[PDB]
Amino acid sequence: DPVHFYETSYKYQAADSTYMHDVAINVSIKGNHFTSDIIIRELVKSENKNYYNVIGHGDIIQKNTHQYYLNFDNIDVYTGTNKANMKPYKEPTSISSLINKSNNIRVVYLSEEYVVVEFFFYDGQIITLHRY
Amino acid sequence: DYPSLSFQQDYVYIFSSDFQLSEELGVALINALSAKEIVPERLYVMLNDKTISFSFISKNKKSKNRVLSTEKKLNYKHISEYIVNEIEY
Ligand SMILES: C[C@H](CCC(=O)NCCS(=O)(=O)O)[C@H]1CC[C@H]2[C@@H]3CC[C@@H]4C[C@H](O)CC[C@]4(C)[C@H]3C[C@H](O)[C@]12C
Ligand SMILES: C[C@H](CCC(=O)NCCS(=O)(=O)O)[C@H]1CC[C@H]2[C@@H]3CC[C@@H]4C[C@H](O)CC[C@]4(C)[C@H]3C[C@H](O)[C@]12C
């Protein structure tokens, strides 16, 4: 069974505030299992910088050629103000609710160099990931 | 759980339950980008109630991805100008 890697980054802005996320996503898929690493830098005017490292793994389930589901076995959340020293952090609701639940990923385009998906962040987001 | 493809022209793919908004935004995007001599390989846009996201795939297969949350709906002109500015810079 070969391993396939998917990597992307995105920036989140809010039209009604200064909240911003800079997010890198790294996903590896082997068979029906996946490992995900999500690195977040969180900014806002009323508070100083903040980093989050979200490590998870679980089952990826193929329903159609374009309909997949990610069901996490576990997710760990680390936080810190400097990427050098991060420390464990109790899972927020938006993380713990993803465990033992099938989260929707819909593929809209597939090439050998990238894939375009609608997925469940922010209750609906479209993004392109580079294929490795 | 996601809007269906409601507008597809040239390199633009817009996923939204609102056809009028989809076509208005899609044409505004093609007009503004062509005027600046920007021709993406593909441009994907998703319009939700409270969230807008897009993926810009450049000629070199590199991607730029953005999410914009808004408490009140924006008209196609503002959404187009936001997307184009993020792509431009
Ligand atoms: C808990 C964190 C800080 C929240 C905060 O700043 N609280 C103070 C303001 S308040 O006064 O208390 O409201 C936030 C900041 C960024 C978030 C991720 C963004 C990507 C992704 C989006 C998906 O939709 C759900 C999963 C997802 C991985 C998210 C997990 C978690 O939610 C994160 C880490
Ligand atoms: C975008 C709409 C779907 C909205 C919706 O409700 N999505 C499911 C949500 S839910 O599951 O119900 O919750 C769809 C529904 C009807 C479509 C027109 C049909 C005639 C004509 C056919 C031509 O080929 C292209 C132009 C044309 C005017 C079309 C434009 C657009 O495609 C329209 C408006």
Author numbering:
A (entry chain B): 0, 31 to 161
B (entry chain A): 165 to 253
Passage from the reporting paper:
In V. parahaemolyticus, the activation of T3SS2 by bile salts is regulated by two transmembrane ToxR-like transcription factors, VtrA (VPA1332) and VtrB (VPA1348). Furthermore, we demonstrate that the periplasmic domains of the transmembrane proteins, VtrA and VtrC, form a functional complex that binds bile salts to activate VtrA’s cytoplasmic DNA binding domain, which in turn induces T3SS2 via the downstream transcription factor VtrB. The structure of VtrA/VtrC periplasmic domains reveals an obligate heterodimer where VtrC recruits structural elements from VtrA to complete a β-barrel with a hydrophobic inner chamber that binds bile salts. Our biochemical data and the structural analysis demonstrated that the periplasmic domains of the inner membrane proteins VtrA and VtrC form a stable complex that functions as a receptor for bile salts.
We next purified the VtrA/VtrC heterodimer in the presence of the bile salt TDC and crystalized this complex and obtained its X-ray structure. A fourth TDC molecule mediated lattice contacts between VtrA chain A and its symmetry mate. Negative power deflections were observed throughout the titration of the bile salt TDC into the VtrA/VtrC solution. These results indicated that TDC binds to the VtrA/VtrC heterodimer in an exothermic manner, with a dissociation constant (KD) of 315.4 nM. In the VtrA/VtrC-TDC heterodimer, the disordered loop has been displaced by the TDC molecule and is now observable in two out of the three heterodimers in the crystallographic asymmetric unit. Remarkably, one of these residues (Ser123) now forms a hydrogen bond with the 12α-hydroxyl group of TDC.
